[PDB]
């Protein structure tokens, strides 16, 4: 559970590949909540929480 206040911006549109993943549109800002090796981070956006590809975002 990330303690710092990391925010990222989506570089692409992402359709969740699983129910536990975050769908989002290019330009959306995501608040990172978990960061695990493997390329998938967990995050929040508009009250929704889930995993997403870390290579789809740019740290703000
Ligand atoms: Cl969205
Ligand atoms: Cl948005
Ligand atoms: Hg992956
Ligand atoms: Hg969203
Ligand atoms: Hg939003």
To one decimal, the resolution in angstroms is 2.0
CA separation, residue 38 to residues 6, 28, 35, 47, 50 (Å): 18, 22, 9, 25, 15
Q: Which two tokens stand for residue 29?
A: 């800002």
The technique is X-ray
Give 44 Cα–ligand 3 centroid separation in angstroms. 18
Give 43 Cα–ligand 4 centroid separation in angstroms. 10
Q: Is 1-60 assigned to CATH 2.30.30.40?
A: yes
Give 39 Cα–ligand 3 centroid separation in angstroms. 5
Give 24 Cα–ligand 1 centroid separation in angstroms. 4
């Amino acid at each position: 559970p990330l303690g710092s206040q990391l925010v990222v911006r989506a570089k692409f549109n992402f359709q969740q590949t699983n129910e536990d993943e975050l769908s989002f549109s290019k330009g959306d800002v995501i608040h990172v909540t978990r960061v695990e090796e493997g390329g998938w981070w967990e995050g929040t956006h508009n009250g929704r929480t889930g995993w997403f590809p870390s290579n789809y975002v740019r740290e703000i």
